[PDB]
Amino acid sequence: QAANPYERGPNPTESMLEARSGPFSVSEERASRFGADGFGGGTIYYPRENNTYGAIAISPGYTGTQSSIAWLGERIASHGFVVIAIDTNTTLDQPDSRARQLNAALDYMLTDASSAVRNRIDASRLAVMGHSMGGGGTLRLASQRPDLKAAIPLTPWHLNKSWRDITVPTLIIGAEYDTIASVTLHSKPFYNSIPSPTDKAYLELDGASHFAPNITNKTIGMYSVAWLKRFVDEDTRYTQFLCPGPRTLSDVEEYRSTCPF
Template sequence: MSQHESTALASRPARAWLARKAVAGTAVVLGLVAGMAAPQPALAADNPYQRGPNPTAASIAATTGPFAIASVSVARGNGFGGGVIYYPTDTSQGTFGAIAISPGLNGTWPGIAWLGPRLASQGFVVFGIETNNLNDSPTSRGTQLLAALDYLTQRSSVRTRVDATRLAVAGHSMGGGGALDAALRRPSLQAAIGNAPYLPSGNLSTDRVPTLIYAMQNDTLVPPSRLTTMYNTIPATTERGYIQITGAGHNYIGQPSTNLARTMIPWFKIFIDNDTRFSQFLCPLSNMSGISQYRNSCPLI
């Protein structure tokens, strides 16, 4: 089902590094042809955003990643309803990219809180937010996700641990719609993930942020047919992915899921950290177990 639809926008801050890497790669190839190539440096030195050891199929499916983490609670205010920040305690590798996540209609962060430690232990700062009201619209949740990122990078107690140029959003249901709404309004974001996302317009034709959409095969609230149509509105110039989880209902994300984690982690690693080591897990999808449909714009980077 995979086909190459596009490459990422070169104007994005994190993509500039890739352009420099491509030039450097050309020089290496020319050197090899001339028989004068020097040993290449380690990838970590080549990519200043890379964090953590070389990934494996087991490491992206593990309940705990390679980074020890801590968390801090945030009170209501600052444009959103508070929440919890999870962050790696390691300060030796520099700053980390960050992800703000919103729950869905009538949901609270504890309902999907397994995502916090699961993602943070892979080398991200993760901000699981509470919304101002349980019935906030996708547009309101998008506004709150952006406010949460601004708070995280400018005023939070962990702001010095965050790279403010490498930010992403995610969410479930109306929170997923909020993540997509935030991506439409802030194209400088590095990645967006909507899990069974509800976005009233269903239109992502102006989306410039690498976007992954999850559909649940047995979802009657936000059916896969609606999400397939929405996915198809993403421009060919934007990196995109679509994953349908076999036999799952709308609230599948409420329980820890290896099928979600092992695909979310590579998406965030590729686009937040520019870490091509993770491309092997999505291009092609290395494990289709529990996944009934997969569409993408591989090779992604």
């Protein structure tokens, strides 16, 4: 019973979570395509301050590259995380392949990145995220790695609709008007399959296209950071944003959750 050892940064506000950057200055290190084993390389964003933080790997979708998701890796790192935005071995790789590559990327941050990166990661506190087939890869990795602290699939796409074995806190973010990975066929079946007692939430962005996660988006930014803070840092200062959660007439079409977790 003491102050949370993983707490980082100032007491949070909605304004602070909606801003383009959080309170940590960030630096970047390349994971070379000519040096990354089992994935396509990427960029690691990390806080300049020398402390330890949770580590997160983020996968783009089909035809996508690290630039599709770079804004989000940078924004999340600026809240006190080490985050790799990956390129895949090929841009046509399937969701299960993206799952192995998110796994490789975690391993890369822990073993093969520079000293500066490795010294800033608490190796025991990891999470994964991903857009469309990358969000399918997130669900698969989450299923296979119950040691992970959180999973955030973003407009996910996967042909397997049943994720009943996931025990990792999962936030699925769907897009109301997604014409590629319709929430009817992908996000809602995925979320509906995860049973109690797993913590989870479903947040559907009102008005959003499939590509919302590829452009700076204050709703994805705020709620992705709140989720990673609550589950990767166990930072209960962030529960207030998640529970009862967004007003649902607004930028959120629907929000379901297992609050207060």
